[PDB]
Paper text:
In the life cycle of the influenza virus, the viral genome RNA (vRNA) or the positive-sense complementary RNA (cRNA) segments are encapsidated by a virus-encoded [name] (NP), with their 5′ and 3′ termini clamped by the polymerase complex (FluPol; composed of PA, PB1, and PB2), thus forming the ribonucleoprotein complexes (RNPs). These structures reveal detailed FluPol–NP–RNA coupling and suggest a conformational shift in RNPs during the viral life cycle.
In the FluPol:NP-0:RNA unit, the nucleotides at the 5′ and 3′ ends of vRNA form a distal double-stranded section of the vRNA promoter, which extrudes out from FluPol and points to NP-0. The loop spanning residues D72 to K90 in NP-0, which includes an ɑ-helix region (D72-E81), inserts into the fork of the double-stranded part of the paired vRNA, thus separating them into single strands. The single-stranded RNA in both 5′ and 3′ directions is further bound into a deep positively charged groove clamped by the head and the body domain of NP-0, forming an RNA-binding groove to protect the RNA. The interacting residues of 5′ RNA in NP-0 include L61, R65, G86, K87, N144, T147, Y148, Q149, T151, R152, R208, R355, G356, R361, G362, Q364, A366 and S367. The residues of NP-0 that contact with the 3′ RNA include R74, Y78, H82, R156, T157, R174, R195, R195, M196, R199, F206 and K214. The structures of NP-0 and NP+2, which have the best densities for the NPs in two representative positions, make structural movements in the D72-K90 and Q405-G460 regions. It is worth noting that the loop spanning residues D72-K90 (D72-K90 loop) of NP-0 folds into an ɑ-helix upon binding to the fork of the double-stranded region of the vRNA, which is consistent with observation in other RNA-NP complex structures. The interaction of NP and vRNA has two distinct forms, either in FluPol:NP-0:RNA unit, or in NP+1:NP+2:RNA unit representing the vRNA in complex with NPs in the regular positions. Compared to NPs in the regular position (e.g., NP+2), two regions of the polypeptide of NP-0 (D72-K90 and I201-N211) exhibit a clear conformational shift upon binding with RNA and FluPol, in particular the D72-K90 loop that folded into an ɑ-helix. Additional, the distal 5′ and 3′ vRNA duplex are stabilized and separated by NP-0, which is not consistent with the previous vRNP model that proposed the 5′ and 3′ distal ends would attach one NP molecular, respectively.
Numbering used by the authors: 21 to 385, 411 to 431, 438 to 471
Write the structure that this text describes.
RNA sequence: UCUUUGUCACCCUGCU
RNA sequence: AGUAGAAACAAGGGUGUUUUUUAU
């Protein structure tokens, strides 16, 4: 029964909304500005960083004059004279937490917060790039397809594997191995056992992510590498190279920022009385009645930033180009075409001329086509840069492959088709 | 019983 | 595992530096 899970989603949303209207009562943020997105985004960032046992270690060490480690904050954004200002403020950890508990009947409800971190992470990946990290690893950048959701902490929602990507697993494993061959003490001790268990756990997560026989066999052979070595890296490399085709739909939860919260409850939709279906028509049934705004820099066409943030929230970073095209009815791409800059604002950047905009947040729109498309010969030439498996690997790899673009998963339907 | 970490590079030693 | 045999090896010791800002 979904409905008890829905009772869960309801209790967490109402706890969080209690805290939200409390915070506002401490914020008196205007209703108009109640939709300028960057404000509530950094507002989110606040409570995100607010939770860190490691930061607790930070304060314990007191290595630097970190801003009252027991208290945290960042730049906030109010206006004057129709123009806007920057304000560095900071709340106190225990105080926010105490709100949080009497916002959560004394509990925490980490669920919605982790959801918000999913939000921030998908935003980053959709809006930014980290090829320089691959430079730190040394493999093809265009491998990027499987970096969906890269920026998530090692202690964040572990079931987030729903979004944690293959390439993430690859690169983190390579890290562990690299650092592993950097020390013998790395394995001696209970630290060794616990890290080994977690390592194998990551391997098992990868198994779950794999769905084909030869892949299972190669990944298993990998798992047997009980000692950190070097060849395993290249095995994983070519396995990923073959899997570039061999992709299955991942969990893509159309997580939208919470800034809606005020207007969300003003619209009357508690996650309780109706639960929710985050995948399906429910997301598109809530991305039209809402309303959200954003601070604007001139001489950057506000329409570019519009499309960028819209699809960023849409989390379609690796969706079919032409699918997204018929999805919004006006051409889209990776950012290279998305001629704009970041949605937020940097410190030294001079806000002294910025502007405001009631931004557009809509689109055009069963499974008419399979969107199937083979690859290009460069894809197979990728292999020539290099067990029994490679025979089978090569075999299917040369005839014909079923899907060109990375992924095309969404419960989308027609807007006027709210039932289907 | 499903709980690595806020990130990596350089020296030296050869019986004292 | 193996060398070896009344106790050992299967290497041993030091040096670095993180809160933001983003696309080739």
């Amino acid at each position: 029964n979904a409905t008890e899970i829905r009772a869960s989603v309801g209790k967490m949303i109402n706890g969080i909304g209690r805290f939200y209207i409390q915070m506002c009562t401490e914020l008196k943020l205007s209703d108009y500005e109640g939709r300028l997105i960057q404000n509530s985004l950094t507002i989110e960032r606040m409570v995100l960083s607010a939770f860190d046992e490691r930061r607790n270690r930070y304060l314990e060490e007191h290595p630097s004059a970190g801003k009252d480690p027991k208290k945290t904050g960042g730049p906030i954004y109010k206006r004057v004279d129709g123009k806007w200002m920057r304000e560095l403020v900071l709340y106190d950890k225990e105080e926010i937490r105490r709100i949080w508990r009497q916002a959560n009947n004394g509990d925490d409800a980490t669920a919605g917060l982790t959801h918000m971190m999913i939000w921030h992470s998908n935003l980053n990946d959709t809006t930014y790039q980290r090829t320089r990290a691959l430079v730190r690893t040394g493999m093809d950048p265009r491998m990027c397809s499987l970096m969906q959701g890269s920026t998530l902490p090692r202690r964040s929602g572990a079931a987030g594997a729903a979004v944690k990507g293959v390439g993430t697993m690859v690169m983190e494993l390579i890290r562990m191995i690299k650092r592993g061959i950097n020390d013998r003490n790395f394995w001696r001790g209970e630290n060794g056992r616990k890290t080994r268990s977690a390592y194998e756990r990551m391997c098992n997560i990868l198994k779950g992510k794999f769905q084909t026989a030869a892949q299972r066999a190669m990944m298993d052979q990998v798992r047997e590498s009980r000692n950190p070595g070097n060849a395993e890296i290249e095995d994983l490399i070519f396995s990923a190279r073959s899997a570039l085709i061999l992709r299955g739909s991942v969990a893509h939860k159309s997580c939208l920022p919470a800034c809606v919260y005020g207007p969300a409850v003003a619209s009357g939709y508690d996650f309780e009385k109706e639960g929710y279906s985050l995948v399906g028509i429910d997301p598109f049934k809530l991305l039209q009645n809402s309303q959200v705004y954003s601070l604007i820099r001139p001489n950057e066409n506000p329409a570019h930033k519009s499309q960028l943030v819209w699809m960023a929230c849409h989390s379609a970073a690796f969706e079919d180009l032409r699918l997204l095209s018929f999805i919004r009815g006006t051409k889209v791409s990776p950012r290279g075409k998305l001629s704009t800059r970041g949605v937020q604002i940097a410190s030294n950047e001079n806000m002294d001329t910025m502007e405001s905009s009631t931004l557009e947040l809509r689109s055009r729109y069963a499974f008419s086509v399979q969107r199937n498309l083979p690859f290009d010969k460069s894809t197979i030439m990728a292999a020539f840069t290099g067990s029994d498996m490679r025979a089978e690997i090569i075999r299917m790899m040369e005839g014909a492959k079923p899907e060109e673009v990375s992924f095309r998963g969404r419960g989308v339907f027609e807007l006027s088709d709210e039932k289907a």
